[PDB]
Amino acid sequence: GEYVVAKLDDLINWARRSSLWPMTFGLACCAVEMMHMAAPRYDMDRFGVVFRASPRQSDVMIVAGTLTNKMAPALRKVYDQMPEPRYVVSMGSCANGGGYYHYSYSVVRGCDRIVPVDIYVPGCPPTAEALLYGILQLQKKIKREKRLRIWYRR
Amino acid sequence: FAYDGLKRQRLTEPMVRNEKGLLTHTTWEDALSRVAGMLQSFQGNDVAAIAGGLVDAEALIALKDLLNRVDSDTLCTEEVFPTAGAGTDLRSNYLLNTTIAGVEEADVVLLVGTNPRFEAPLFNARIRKSWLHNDLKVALIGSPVD
Amino acid sequence: GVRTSPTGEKVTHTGQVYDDGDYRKVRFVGRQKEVNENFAIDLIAEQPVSQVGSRVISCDGGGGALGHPRVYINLDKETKTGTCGYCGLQFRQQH
Amino acid sequence: ILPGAAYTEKSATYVNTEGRAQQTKVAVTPPGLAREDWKIIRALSEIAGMTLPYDTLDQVRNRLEEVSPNLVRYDDVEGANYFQQASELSKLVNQQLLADPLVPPQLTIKDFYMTDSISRASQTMAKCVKAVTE
Amino acid sequence: TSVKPIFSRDMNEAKRRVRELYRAWYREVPNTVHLFQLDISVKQGRDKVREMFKKNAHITDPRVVDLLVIKGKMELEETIKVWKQRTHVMRFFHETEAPRPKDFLSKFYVGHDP
Amino acid sequence: PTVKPPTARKFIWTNHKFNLSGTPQQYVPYSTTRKKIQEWVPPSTPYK
Amino acid sequence: LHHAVIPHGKGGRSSVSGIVATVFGATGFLGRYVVNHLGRMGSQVIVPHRCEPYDTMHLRPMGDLGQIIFMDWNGRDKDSIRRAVEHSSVVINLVGREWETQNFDFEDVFVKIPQAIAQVSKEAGVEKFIHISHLNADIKSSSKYLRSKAVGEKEVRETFPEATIIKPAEIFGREDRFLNYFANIKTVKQPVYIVDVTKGIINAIKDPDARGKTFAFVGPSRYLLFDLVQYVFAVAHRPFTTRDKVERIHTTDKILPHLPGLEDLGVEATPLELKAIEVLRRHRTQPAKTIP
Amino acid sequence: RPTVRPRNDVAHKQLSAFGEYVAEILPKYVQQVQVSCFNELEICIHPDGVIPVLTFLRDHSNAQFKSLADLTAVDIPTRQNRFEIVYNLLSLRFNSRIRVKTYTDELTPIESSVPVYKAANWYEREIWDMFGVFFANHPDLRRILTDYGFEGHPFRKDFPLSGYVELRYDDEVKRVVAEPVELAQEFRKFDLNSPWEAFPAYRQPP
Ligand SMILES: NC(=O)C1=CN([C@@H]2O[C@H](COP(=O)(O)OP(=O)(O)OC[C@H]3O[C@@H](n4cnc5c(N)ncnc54)[C@H](OP(=O)(O)O)[C@@H]3O)[C@@H](O)[C@H]2O)C=CC1
Ligand code: SF4
Ligand SMILES: [Zn+2]
């Protein structure tokens, strides 16, 4: 029986990591490098990562740029409308911890004050390749998930 | 250079004696309750205070006001000063009335029972300045210190 | 020169280690304490003293422009060696 | 034991040998649970039902002014007079001089470095004492 | 002591603007509680509005009063037009800020701040 | 590196490691300085 | 106090409360509020969890960097309990299930697991222990849920005598299985607000007089179950589950005058009428009569 | 001299001459005229002269400063009138730039220049938001950059760099909340100024 549960986890994990549909908050500079990840050289679509997805068909939110206090409530609302399972990738110093505006009166010091974060991509900005490395790292995180194995043991 | 002593042997928490007679950390609430209880049960000469060398004036008057409210006037310092005659009635009895800068105006200085070099190094330096530039005449009654 | 404490936690080259009652070592439970094992203080001590035939030698740390600012070391005292203030290499005037 | 603050950790009034009142400023706060000294006594007075009539630094310094007005004249040297009156009283009672010679407590540099709790706790002052005695 | 006025030329005219602003705020609270789906009562909303006015009761400069009303009108415009979100409206109530101690002893126990 | 090998140093890692985030070998930050203020330790024996 | 746990700051996110807490059952209803209030004031929180890390994600924003630490644990593995508690100054047990599973019955969640946490905490030297029981815990209850709560409540008091035991009534709140339970459809009830229970728990950690005591957390008003369910439907704008669950809902809320309550920890009980709409607004597509 | 920026005396004279020209024509408002060593002309005016002086520079046939390049403020707390209002204008006809400066304090309105330049609309909103200077007769004066309900004017020298409040999501109330700002690492103030004078040419008489 546990053999069945192990293989269904593999199946659903494979499907979810193989069809990661992102919503990008293109907040600032870092949005440019995610555009270069979609561009032909890296072609995120070839991994199953569609270029643009609506928030309600999205699986991963990519916070790409500085999150201000004025924008923080809007970002939380979009996260709360994401169907589950949902993941958050924080990309760039600004989103990671405030970066170069960390000491500003108007900047949230890291988007993890507003939403939970699964992957932190460092850089100002991270290169398109560095972002792609972070996306592939999120895929490996999903591969490790054991939702049914843990469900069967409750 | 003595500032590094501010990082050693510091008192960081209130302490009280426990059942075994050893000092043990406690809260501010608990420690002050123990003191307040003993303070409320004594009056007059049963309560005294001694002020150390580095105490500030705000704490000196607060402690004086507190013991005065149990009718205690035994507010003492470690350093003696004769209470004979005027005592501390007149400030001029216990002050450097000439002022430190006044040394540069003097022509004779009589030092009595003191070693200013170590007691007041910057005061002694002000004497040497006068000695060097004003041809000040200095005499000492006491030990022949350098 | 890495050593462990009575708790088994490794002491860093800066002498850091959480003591017995420090809760903060809970951060290492299920993970690890990053420690660099190549203590620079011990590595420099392994270098031999260079014997030179002059009162003053210069050191730039090697590699020319890839080293450190060039400094001149006085070797008049025979009690000890001349040590470069930048890289720690030692020099001694011969006889 | 009530942990107080050192002179680098409070804004507090000191009067030098001239009678000149000066104040410190807080450079760092007291360590751990230590508190400003006049606040400890003020807090103690309230728990003992004898609340003192001042709640801030400015108010305790208003109190200091009621007792000795010169204590809040910062950097000023207030002259003191009436040496004649003091001299008259000093003669009223005759006390004999002891035969002991006048010997200062500090005779050499070794006695200079440690004279209070702060300097007695200083490792630098210990090195100085060792250096001049050896 | 001659200065350029903002709107009011004296405190009597300034006070008329204050009362108009208070009336506008008082009447808007029931709508705000409904549109923003607030969990406060209308009484709480109006009590908060009254509190905000009261803390500025001691002003005697008509220019300062004028600026306070100008800012009050802008705050009301942001609320009426739903430029604010629910978070902005609820920031007047400090719902997650545990009360700071006020008496001397409580402040003495916790830290060094006056 | 088969044609121009890197310069050898004794301290250079002989075994490369890949990204270890999410494993028991992940880096955990901590302060590398020692305690600054030393508290006074009361005497062990009783004497009030 | 060890120097690391002396309080500092102004009680905010970046402050240091001096509390180092292990919260078992932190991924549930009560746990999310407890962890939030601990992280609000800058406490170190250790979160042992049995579930997927994905299911602990909502806890991460609750503390500043490094203040929330997650660990795996198994209720039946005492070594995993020892790892989680050996650095803590307080242990909080919120473990429980409203139903039984093939792997865990009520005697496991409410007796065996709490006793093991209490015993290992005692051995590890933990000073404070806070254990959540139930107001209606009773070995003669018709509910196997409430009978186990009584047995375990006794074993904790014996194993860790200094434990603070808290006995809440039915707790209502956004994620409750009480008001939501009625909205998803003889007896007097005295339900208590989730934030009140959380504040009571937090103040028990600080209060030294709370050690060794047993508290009953109840709301300010008593209601007939019929009058309460009627009010829920009115608030939800709606025209007006296991066997053990039904027994609990029909058990009258005990009145234990001798026990200290929320007012003995400085907490004012929140009336249901103030907070009911908060919980029931999402259910939308006359205050209830109270017993004097 | 390869490293020294060359001077331009022809432009310096032209701008100086136009500076006198402007001051002769608008003596009611012009308080000072100066030309910098890198050839920028600044007219300093009484705040009453904003509309007349700007209108003259836009419309006069020897001016034709049709473009408002920028409008901003500078906070100088030591001055009685701490706010300096700066208008940078461009004349395409004469390929020239000019700067007009006036002043105000916290409580004194400045006349809005939207009637002269429609570009002024948002700039004056930004000055209101960042500095708290009120512009009279503005078609729509309100904050433009700061968050809704934000208190204070961040660009004032006495406003702290990190402000007074910071935001986070709170799970208990299920929304973003504002709280007094605490920093895990305080911003480290640096004292960088050398104690030796750099530029004798600007020494202030003692
Ligand atoms: N809510 C109420 O109305 C009242 C509750 N209580 C008590 O308060 C405590 C918490 O209440 P609540 O938070 O509502 O309960 P929840 O069911 O909401 O959360 C229960 C917690 O227990 C954990 N848990 C359950 N079974 C196991 C297990 N076998 N091994 C390990 N962990 C386990 C769950 O973790 P996972 O997510 O991994 O399942 C979850 O974190 C419980 O003890 C409950 O009985 C008392 C009175 C009233
Ligand atoms: S992290 Fe760098 S590149 Fe990205 S938005 Fe911030 S400043 Fe721009
Ligand atoms: Zn060198």
Short mmCIF file of C-alpha atoms in Angstrom, two decimals, chain A residues 66-69 93-113 124, chain G residues 14 64-65, chain H residues 160-163 165-167 181-188:
data_model
loop_
_atom_site.label_atom_id
_atom_site.label_comp_id
_atom_site.label_asym_id
_atom_site.label_seq_id
_atom_site.Cartn_x
_atom_site.Cartn_y
_atom_site.Cartn_z
CA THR A 66 10.96 46.56 -4.92
CA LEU A 67 7.84 46.23 -2.77
CA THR A 68 6.75 49.59 -1.37
CA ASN A 69 4.39 50.10 1.54
CA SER A 93 17.75 42.13 -3.25
CA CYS A 94 14.80 44.52 -2.99
CA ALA A 95 12.27 41.70 -2.68
CA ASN A 96 14.66 39.54 -0.67
CA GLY A 97 15.34 42.07 2.08
CA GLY A 98 14.88 45.59 0.76
CA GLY A 99 18.26 45.82 -0.93
CA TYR A 100 19.46 49.30 -1.76
CA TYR A 101 16.29 50.89 -0.36
CA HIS A 102 16.35 48.84 2.85
CA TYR A 103 16.53 51.97 5.03
CA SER A 104 13.74 53.82 3.22
CA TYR A 105 10.59 55.05 4.94
CA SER A 106 8.43 53.77 2.04
CA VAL A 107 9.87 50.30 1.33
CA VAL A 108 8.91 46.93 2.78
CA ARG A 109 12.12 45.29 4.01
CA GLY A 110 11.67 42.04 2.14
CA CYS A 111 8.48 40.62 0.65
CA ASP A 112 8.61 37.81 3.23
CA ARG A 113 7.08 40.30 5.66
CA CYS A 124 20.62 43.13 -8.14
CA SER G 14 12.91 43.07 16.08
CA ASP G 64 11.80 38.25 12.25
CA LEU G 65 14.70 36.48 10.56
CA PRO H 160 14.10 60.38 9.68
CA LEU H 161 15.48 58.32 6.83
CA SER H 162 13.53 55.19 7.78
CA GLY H 163 10.39 57.01 8.88
CA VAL H 165 6.12 53.23 10.87
CA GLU H 166 6.72 50.02 8.94
CA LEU H 167 4.32 47.52 7.42
CA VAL H 181 9.60 50.97 13.03
CA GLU H 182 12.25 48.72 14.57
CA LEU H 183 15.39 47.80 12.63
CA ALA H 184 17.38 44.61 13.06
CA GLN H 185 20.40 46.69 12.03
CA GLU H 186 20.30 50.43 12.66
CA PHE H 187 21.56 52.59 9.83
CA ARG H 188 25.17 53.43 10.69
#
